[PDB]
């Protein structure tokens, strides 16, 4: 067994106005290094792992693709795994700050303090667990983000392969927030809570080699349908002197719906192309029909049919399933294990033109009555040597919901050199 290693990364991020030229900041044209040494131990049914992180950048640039000062030191992963409960080789119980992942990247793709149980067999896959955030384990952050404070996650899943390469399964996730929203006229932070309450996500999903870059099948697919219920309290905010002020709350219950469908043509072993459609419900009375995600998602997957993970709702726009409709068109190319290139086009709309949307990457006010968010074109190019050189850039063109006063175009482009030891 290999007890230790080191991962070296050099990232160059160029971000134009993320607020679309409407607020100070939102520009990053800086470089940085990210060093991740790790340790591993194995003694029969028992396992233990650790991963550190040391970052030195010329500005606060993104070096982690997963959901989350210039220099910092942190504890990324620390767990103890037990594999002696059953005779099954793919069954283990993991406890500690670990990486919860799911193939679609839409339910969970993060590093969180959790007690997780995995049961993986030939015809059946089942998982269950609990997760809560108690710290950032970072040197530059002493206080835990109020957003992630007192939010308990209870999740489960069960899948079956009804036909070879064809899977059907159900998922459940409960978020029990026992915290409190800001009182009126308070300084609402950038890391502050948007909601409190009890929420139950119930979903059904069907895939046919949806995230497999090496498939024998001529056509690939994914079909997802999620329902959301429970009691939710949303915090209402106002602008004032560019310092967001809390202006009350809206307490009710939720009855929202989320959908994600897609199809991929495998022309040959190198060339692939496909289409996608996603809908996250919006509006209703007191935001009752407004859909949202668990808050553990990254929205990143191998939906283009390559080894490289691409953002499902744009690298620039970085949308999420909340009052949002999306139309996607893509193309792929891959030379064995030497290269991979992806080209992705997206068109975004609003489900309700009076309500707010789900987005990162963009921090600009939406004008009422206008449904057209905008369009995007993504490019991803990877060269492999352990070591790799990647370019991942997105060019977003704002629509009528942003109106005049906004720049004609917006971009976010990264370069990653990852050499591993
Ligand atoms: C619930 C959170 C617990 C945190 C787990 C801590 C794990 C930290 C480091 C893992 C590496 C352990 C290496 C030391 C060890 O005891 O094994 C001896 C090893 O050298 C022989 O294989
Ligand atoms: C300050 C923390 C640094 C921890 C160092 C991690 C070990 C690096 C080992 C990589 C190079 C040697 N090798 C080839 C034997 O692996
Ligand atoms: C394949 C062509 C990719 C070119 C990269 C995109 C252009 C961004 C230019 C980087 C400098 C950023 N700045 C400061 C001019 O905005
Ligand atoms: C071949 C063009 C690729 C696009 C450039 C990627 C962004 C790198 C910009 C970092 C500039 C660092 N600087 C100026 C702070 O020293
Ligand atoms: C390279 C790994 C070294 C870890 C350095 C991180 C230590 C800072 C985090 C301290 C724990 C957080 N808190 C809030 C509970 O104090
Ligand atoms: Ca700005
Ligand atoms: Na086992
Ligand atoms: Na494929």
UniProtKB/Swiss-Prot annotation:
Highest taxon of source: Bacteria
UniProt keyword terms in alphabetical order: Alginate biosynthesis, Cell outer membrane, Membrane, Signal
UniProt-annotated location(s): Cell outer membrane
InterPro entries the record matches: Alginate_export_dom, Alginate_Permeability_Chnl
Entry's transmembrane regions: none
Gene Ontology CC terms, in alphabetical order: cell outer membrane
GO biological process, alphabetically ordered: alginic acid biosynthetic process
Annotated spans, Disordered: 278-302
Pathway assigned to this chain's UniProt record: Glycan biosynthesis; alginate biosynthesis
Main location: membrane
Chain intervals with Polar residues compositional bias: 290-302
Membrane topology term: Peripheral membrane protein
Purpose: Has non-porin-like, channel-forming properties and probably functions as an alginate permeability pore.
Family per similarity comment: Belongs to the AlgE family.
Protein name (database record): Alginate production protein AlgE
Lineage: Bacteria, Pseudomonadati, Pseudomonadota, Gammaproteobacteria, Pseudomonadales
Gene (name only): algE
